[PDB]
Design a protein around this ligand. Structure first.
Ligand SMILES: NC(=O)c1ccc[n+]([C@@H]2O[C@H](COP(=O)([O-])OP(=O)(O)OC[C@H]3O[C@@H](n4cnc5c(N)ncnc54)[C@H](OP(=O)(O)O)[C@@H]3O)[C@@H](O)[C@H]2O)c1
Ligand SMILES: Nc1nc(=O)c2c([nH]1)NC[C@H](CCc1ccc(C(=O)N[C@@H](CCC(=O)O)C(=O)O)cc1)C2
Length: 159
């Protein structure tokens, strides 16, 4: 199955590394737990933002152009990206917006972190039919000495 994992600021705004200001080690732990030993698919801009492969995961990068880094696997279409994951229980799609838009209709699960942070940005997580999705887990945390903002983890499954 295909899953999307994303961090959503106020108004479901999404973005890249330098554009997302919070410091949420708890969310990084959540992301790691939920993606480790699974293939991760990302767009080229997300790849450039991260700057180095995510360890212990197959990193698959979408780009219309030839690859430019042998440390990751490069593909030129959504269907090629999925095929490059092989036969695994769960494929993790880690954005960005253009990639989320394409994979959402194919996805069975969403892993969302709803962060109580107001950020500059025009880009939002794709609109999806709320009635298409059942919330199966959520867990709220206030900010603390390590985490700059309050945040809520949520898993939704397609119903
Ligand atoms: N300044 C602003 O107001 C503003 C607003 C919104 C976004 N942005 C910028 O936009 C970028 C983030 O956009 P994003 O989150 O949408 O990026 P993303 O999903 O991480 O990456 C998009 C890239 O992935 C590749 N890709 C996606 N689908 C593909 C497909 N089906 N086949 C082949 N390649 C595919 C393309 O790479 P190739 O280009 O290599 O073909 C595409 O340009 C950042 O650089 C951000 O700064 C800026
Ligand atoms: N839950 C979640 N949080 C986020 O901030 C993001 C998503 N999802 N999805 C898309 C994008 C992912 C950004 C992103 C980039 C690098 C690492 C990373 O380096 N993670 C390491 C652990 C880092 C640490 O332990 O400090 C990892 O091994 O997963 C995590 C997230 C932003």
């Amino acid at each position: 199955m295909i899953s999307l994992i994303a961090a959503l600021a106020v108004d479901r705004v999404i973005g890249m590394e330098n554009a997302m200001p919070w410091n949420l080690p708890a969310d990084f732990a959540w992301f790691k737990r939920n993606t480790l030993n699974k293939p991760v698919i990302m767009g080229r801009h997300t790849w450039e933002s991260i700057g180095r492969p995510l360890p212990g995961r197959k990193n698959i990068i979408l780009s219309s152009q030839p690859g430019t880094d042998d440390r990751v696997t490069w593909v030129k279409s959504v269907d090629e990206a999925i095929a490059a994951c092989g036969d695994v229980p769960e494929i993790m799609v880690i954005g960005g917006g253009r990639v989320y838009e394409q994979f959402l209709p194919k996805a069975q699960k969403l892993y969302l972190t709803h962060i109580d942070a107001e950020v500059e940005g025009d880009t939002h997580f794709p609109d999806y039919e709320p009635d298409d999705w059942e919330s199966v887990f959520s867990e709220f945390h206030d900010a603390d000495a390590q985490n700059s903002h309050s945040y809520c983890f949520e898993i939704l499954e397609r119903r």
